[PDB]
Design a protein around this ligand. Structure first.
Ligand code: NI
Length: 196
């Protein structure tokens, strides 16, 4: 990709400790219900704050997002929708300042499959916080390892690896997606790398 930095540690799945972003992960997991509740509050389509997720192609099913940060820019109207979550995230420039990432609620509905794909850059890691996870039917593969989400828990993967998602439940799957700068990027790089 045009948006890669050579030599950045490359592995499909990361532990929180490996990323060094332990305070961010702890805060996400401490406050998971608070974050979930704000997502649920605006989740009404009648409200209509969740919009289609066109980030990548899906074979079938429905997929929606409510984006709080985009390329390091706070969505003001969105944060009025999720004020406590936004206030919380502001403590963590490693994600709010990630100009190559996003911060968003992501809902995936029953009968959805997202084709194998890669993100645009090896310069971010993608955190998933489980908010509402169906008992069965949802999973995500990254490279050769397939995993499931857990409510209140963070998964972290390098989405520049090929990954793929299935929603084979009967009820919706809500997660919170938090992108961070790859931890081996210098402060100079975090300041100067053009957004994507
Ligand atoms: Ni993806």
């Amino acid at each position: 990709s045009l948006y890669n930095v050579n030599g950045l540690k490359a592995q499909p799945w990361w532990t929180p400790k490996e990323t060094g972003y332990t305070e961010l992960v702890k805060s996400l997991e401490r406050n998971w219900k608070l974050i979930r509740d704000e997502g649920l509050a605006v989740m009404d389509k009648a409200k209509g704050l969740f919009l289609p997720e066109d980030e990548n192609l899906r074979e079938k099913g429905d997929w929606s997002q409510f984006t709080l940060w985009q390329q390091g820019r706070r969505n003001e109207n969105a944060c009025k929708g999720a004020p406590k979550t936004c206030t919380l995230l502001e403590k963590f420039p490693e994600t709010t300042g990630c100009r190559r990432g996003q911060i968003k609620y992501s809902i995936m509905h029953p009968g959805t499959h997202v084709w194998p794909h890669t993100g645009p850059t090896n310069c971010r890691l993608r955190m998933h916080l489980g908010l509402v996870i169906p008992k069965e039917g949802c999973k995500i593969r990254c490279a050769n390892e397939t995993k499931t989400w857990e409510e209140g828990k963070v998964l972290i993967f390098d989405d520049s690896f090929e990954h793929e998602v299935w929603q084979d439940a009967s009820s919706f799957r809500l997660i919170f997606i938090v992108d961070v700068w790859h931890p081996e990027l210098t402060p100079q790089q975090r300041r100067s790398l053009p957004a994507i």
